[PDB]
């Protein structure tokens, strides 16, 4: 009875949703090809130079020219470049919704004295050369040692030891890293007035700033030196 | 003496790599250009009305038409579009580089009974909630206090981790995994007769497989039921 219906609906409702799956997938080529081009074509026309006139003469060419007419080997290419951007699309949006998480560890390691709980130290001595990112600390020295370390923590974690780690490569990028901070300390209605800015007004800072590129290597040699 | 020119010279190779670093960003966004052209040239590309004759009146070629004549802000969006590509694909390529040396930490937690210590267990782990998934270890367990899991792997995949943890909600991909073994398992002359049967028949490929979406949709509802 109703459970027949059930199960007919079931493989009822995978097909509807398999037959709008597919439709999103090749729109987002189809899509993804005509906002490109649009990018292109908004400065630009909507015409295939490459339209050959051999079997057909029909003018519908304009990107999509005429499948395997005109443009077929091109089609093919920017086919292809649609789907590595949407496989570049996937690992961005598989690298969001790991995101926090709260199951992804970072795994770091950093010098100090902290603990999260009641932690006996037994005389912790055993360095190393390079603290950080030492040996697995599963008791791994000359001898057990009574070692307790580093779980996963929470917080973005492993971006966040990420560029713990990597700010010794560049403490100028570190110094700079307050200025960001409180930039970003500004309200919601502050992002609004940057886009604003930046909408427009930067071809004028662009074309100011190209002589300044020459006084950016002197002032970069100037504090290199000093 | 040459330790002042040793000295001086430090300041001008500084100079000479920051004009080619320079250069090199520049192109970048030129390269973008005239790669996608290209991609464009596929159909030839050989004009833009972004230099329209409003100011001056000679066409200014067909990718990078007037600096500012006419239309340029939509040649500055394009600018900024390729800048923020470039972004992206520099970030991926950091992100590569930094997990082929296995450095870049994997801490794996997921549920096994694999087993190398000295002495270990007789005591182990006796969670009976929060299914088989484990926690950070400090001490995953509720009541773990001489818990020891598992070290990252020097197998240079670290993401294998969750790749292979994150796959048990569709053991389908683990069915597929045996296949792609076998396909990887080839010789290093089979990618490039497979690239070569790729190109330009991908075409009538593409054309058979078309017929057989609709196709593809039954047979997958039909293993469903099964």
Chains 1, 2 share one sequence.
């Not at 603290?131 to 370390?149: A, F, V």
Request: glycine share 6%; with cysteine; proline share 10%.
């Amino acid at each position: 009875m109703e459970n027949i219906t059930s199960g007919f609906l079931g493989p009822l409702l995978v097909l509807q949703a398999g037959f709008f799956l597919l439709t999103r997938i090749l729109t987002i080529p189809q899509s993804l090809d005509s906002w490109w081009t649009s990018l292109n074509f908004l400065g630009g026309t909507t015409v295939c130079l490459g339209q050959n006139s051999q079997s057909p003469i029909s003018n519908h060419s304009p990107t999509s020219c005429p499948p395997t007419c005109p443009g077929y080997r091109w089609m093919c290419l920017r086919r292809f470049i649609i789907f590595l951007f949407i496989l570049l699309l996937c690992l961005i949006f598989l690298l969001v919704l790991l995101d926090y998480q709260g199951m992804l560890p970072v795994c770091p390691l950093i010098p100090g004295s902290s603990t999260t709980s009641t932690g006996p130290c037994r005389t912790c001595t055993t360095p190393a050369q390079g603290t950080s990112m030492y040996p697995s600390c599963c008791c791994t020295k000359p001898s057990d040692g009574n070692c307790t370390c580093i779980p996963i923590p929470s917080s973005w974690a492993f971006g966040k030891f990420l560029w713990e780690w990597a700010s010794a490569r560049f403490s100028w990028l570190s110094l700079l890293v307050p200025f960001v901070q409180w930039f970003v300390g500004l309200s919601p209605t502050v992002w609004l007035s940057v886009i604003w800015m930046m909408w427009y007004w930067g071809p004028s800072l662009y074309s100011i700033l190209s002589p300044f590129l020459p006084l950016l290597p002197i002032f970069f040699c100037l504090w290199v030196y000093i």
